From a paper:
Here, we report the structure of STRADα as part of the STRADα/MO25α heterodimer. With the help of chemical lysine methylation, diffraction of these crystals (retaining the same space group and unit cell dimensions) improved to 2.35 Å. The structure of STRADα exhibits the classical bilobal protein kinase fold, with the N-terminal lobe (residues 59–152) organized around a central β-sheet, and a C-terminal lobe (residues 153–401) that is largely α-helical. A well-resolved molecule of ATP was observed in the cleft between the small and large lobes of the pseudokinase. Met83 replaces one of the conserved Gly residues in the glycine-rich loop, Arg100 substitutes the catalytic Lys residue in the VAIK motif, Ser195 replaces the Asp residue in the HRD motif, His200 substitutes for the conserved Asn in subdomain-VIb, and the entire DFG motif is replaced by GLR (residues 213–215). Consistent with the lack of the DFG motif in STRADα, no Mg2+ ions were observed in the STRADα-ATP complex, despite 1 mM MgCl2 being present in the crystallization mother liquor. The β-phosphate is tethered through interactions with Arg215 from the GLR (DFG) motif, and His200 (subdomain-VIb), basic residues that may substitute for one of the positively charged Mg2+ ions. Although the activation loop of STRADα (residues 212–245) is not phosphorylated, it is well ordered, a feature normally observed only in structures of activated protein kinases that are phosphorylated on their activation loop. Strikingly, the crystal structure of the STRADα/MO25α complex reveals that, in addition to the interaction through the WEF motif, a major additional binding interface involves the STRADα N-terminal kinase lobe and the MO25α concave surface. The αC-helix of STRADα runs along the concave surface of MO25α facing the H3 helixes of the MO25α repeats R4, R3, and R2 (termed the “αC site” here).
Author numbering:
A (entry chain B): -15 to -2, 60 to 291, 348 to 382, 386 to 401, 425 to 431
B (entry chain A): 2 to 336
The structure:
């Protein structure tokens, strides 16, 4: 029994985007994913003229399992609210397609940046700012009893004012079974052929011991190598890249810690944030480090 | 943020603190600082309660603390108050309410399940959770809580036999797809988990349910139509629903609709239509109006079925089913 039924009016003087296709004017394709079934569009939100991202997937090309997998992403993304996790703004059917609207990050992904300019890898200070944001996000995701399962450069987005966001929530997996946290989980990440090189040995070797949040920590290290070199380790290497999986000195010790064979030996994201590597340190330091990249501102019918 | 120490508090004092802080939040006529203070206190108490029930990364929950807490929670009516006032709570506290609620609900002393017993004395909790779908700020957390409630048969029965159940037909077609999906998940669980209960519900409310269900099959929303058509097939092929199924497949207008959905533009839709259509024809005791529709389109159906998703190549059930339906329809004699 409360006295806040004037809430509709209490705020709406502001929020959500209208969950209707017509509100968006599609401009350029800015990206592609979900096994080539998703088109990522830059869009104009008509009621404000503001720029947004529209993610589009034809549900007719999806199996039942693929639709379930996709609805899971929408559930998990509404549970998360964090300065370094990409916000979702609207989700609706524009018929036959799932439309998912998120805020537009004007420097694109860390991989985009590598491809447009930093082909040989990014400067080290930049990597520290970028990986700190990823780690803050992972700390939150891990405290919530989730594993990310797809930390890579293309799942790190940078906004007009240099804020870093972890994306890629589609691959997120709960370890909470029967109301309780499980020490290890066993699910092989579905539709992740391509994410393999960032995956820890214990996620890859299915039917063995299983994994926890410290598997994401290994992916942080792979990403560190990807960001330094401009290419991911084990690229073009056959599926049995497994076997082989079995700059300032602080950076080296950072990477070597993430990449330990034993996950129990790997530090958590919170203690990794206290690592020497980040002492060299955000929304005014990164845009400059990204110079000279500029963002833009048959049969006839039945008879009855 | 200046890092003060945390002083230890009993479950009883935590319940008390939260009760008093919730009372402040319900009031309109308080200063911004007083509201802010109560907001912070609610939040901190909820974190404290969660940690008693789940423990931490360092400590597992201890039974004495848990039992004191559950007892206190039942005596105070706070399980009702937190659902009723859910809108007044911060983003992360709303998720804490869900977790606390879910954990208490799973609580099990012997064979007994005490929270189920308690919600049976306090049934508006269920109806407040269901109504939560209409409010974007609380909908997801309400859904999570409701879906844990309906795991228990007595609570499932209360919702199924209510007027409010039919609100689901609105909720599953909501234009925010995350909430519509959540609601359809709860709706499907209700109809499929406790199969005896569901069979009884369908027999007793046949006409209203299928009148509402018919509207879903006409939906302008592609997923609503696809999902609903799929659930329909799964419902009719279930042995618990045999009586309901025999009623359904005797009505001319239902055959009409399935036959039409076989000619939909969506390959997925026409395949899920097949799953229901096949049952009308496999039926050895076809009524006259049904028999009339099949004989009227005898030649067209045989032709249609011969060329129906022929590229669907190693589904051996689908292939044999199509062969069977063609034989059946060919074997139809006009008296
Ligand atoms: N909010 C955004 N702002 C700017 N660009 C974006 C945004 N979201 C996605 N993109 C672009 O689209 C690309 C593909 O999107 P995303 O990574 O979400 O798809 P994916 O299915 O996870 O990719 P893959 O299947 O290749 O792993 C991103 O790497 C990025 O370049």
């Amino acid at each position: 029994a409360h006295h806040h039924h004037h809430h509709m009016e209490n705020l709406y003087f502001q929020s959500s985007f209208l969950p209707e296709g017509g509100c968006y004017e599609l401009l350029t394709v800015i990206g592609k994913g979900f096994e080539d079934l998703m088109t990522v569009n830059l869009a104009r939100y008509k009621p404000t003229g503001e720029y947004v991202t529209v993610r589009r997937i034809n549900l007719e090309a999806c199996s039942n399992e693929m639709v379930t997998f996709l609805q899971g992403e929408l559930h998990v993304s509404k549970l998360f609210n964090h300065p370094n996790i990409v916000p979702y703004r609207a989700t609706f059917i524009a018929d036959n397609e799932l439309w998912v609207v998120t805020s537009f990050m004007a420097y694109g992904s860390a991989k985009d940046l590598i491809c447009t300019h930093f082909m040989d890898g990014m400067n080290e200070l930049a990597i520290a700012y970028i990986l700190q944001g990823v780690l803050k996000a992972l700390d939150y995701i891990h405290h919530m009893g989730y594993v990310h399962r797809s930390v890579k450069a293309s799942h790190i987005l940078i906004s007009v004012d240099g804020k870093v966001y972890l994306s890629g929530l589609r691959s997120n997996l709960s370890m909470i079974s029967h109301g309780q946290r499980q020490r290890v989980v066993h699910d092989f990440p579905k539709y992740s052929v391509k994410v393999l090189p960032w995956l820890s040995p214990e996620v890859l070797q299915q039917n063995l011991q299983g994994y926890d949040a410290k598997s994401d920590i290994y992916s942080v290290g792979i990403t560190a190598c990807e960001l330094a070199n401009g290419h991911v380790p084990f690229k073009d290497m056959p599926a049995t890249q497994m076997l082989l999986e079995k700059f300032s000195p602080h950076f080296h010790h950072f990477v070597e810690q993430c990449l330990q064979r034993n996950p129990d030996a790997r530090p958590s994201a919170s203690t990794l944030l206290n690592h020497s590597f980040f002492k060299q340190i955000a929304s005014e330091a990164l845009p400059e480090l990204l110079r000279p990249v500029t963002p833009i501102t048959e049969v006839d019918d039945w008879e009855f | 943020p200046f890092p003060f120490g945390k002083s230890h508090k009993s479950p009883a004092d935590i319940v008390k603190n939260l009760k008093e802080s919730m009372a402040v939040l319900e009031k309109q006529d308080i200063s911004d600082k007083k509201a802010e203070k109560a907001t912070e206190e609610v939040s901190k108490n909820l974190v404290a309660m969660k940690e008693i029930l789940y423990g931490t990364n360092e400590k597992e929950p201890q039974t004495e603390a848990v039992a004191q807490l559950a007892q206190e929670l039942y005596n105070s009516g706070l399980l009702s108050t937190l659902v009723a006032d859910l809108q007044l709570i911060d983003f992360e506290g709303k998720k804490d309410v869900a977790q606390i609620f879910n954990n208490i609900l799973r609580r099990q002393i012997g064979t007994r399940t005490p929270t189920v017993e308690y919600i049976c004395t306090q049934q508006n909790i269920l109806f407040m959770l269901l109504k939560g779908y209409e409010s974007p700020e609380i909908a997801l957390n309400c859904g999570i809580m409701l879906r844990e409630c309906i795991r228990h048969e007595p609570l499932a029965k209360i919702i199924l036999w209510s007027e409010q159940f039919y609100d689901f037909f609105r909720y599953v077609e909501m234009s925010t797809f995350d909430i519509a999906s959540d609601a359809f998940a709860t709706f499907k669980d209700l109809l499929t988990r406790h199969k005896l209960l569901s069979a009884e519900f369908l027999e007793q409310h046949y006409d209203r349910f299928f009148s509402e269900y018919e509207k879903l099959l006409h939906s302008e929303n592609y997923v609503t139509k696809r999902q609903s058509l799929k659930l329909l097939g799964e419902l009719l092929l279930d042995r618990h629903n045999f009586t309901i199924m025999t009623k359904y497949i005797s009505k001319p207008e239902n055959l009409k609709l399935m036959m039409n959905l076989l000619r939909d533009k969506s390959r997925n839709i026409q395949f899920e239509a097949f799953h229901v259509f096949k049952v009308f024809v496999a039926n050895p005791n076809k009524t006259q109006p049904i028999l009339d529709i099949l004989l009227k389109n005898q030649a067209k159906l045989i032709e249609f079925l011969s060329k129906f998703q022929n590229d669907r190549t190693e589904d051996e059930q689908f292939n044999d089913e199509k062969t069977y339906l063609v034989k059946q329809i060919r074997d139809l004699k006009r008296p």
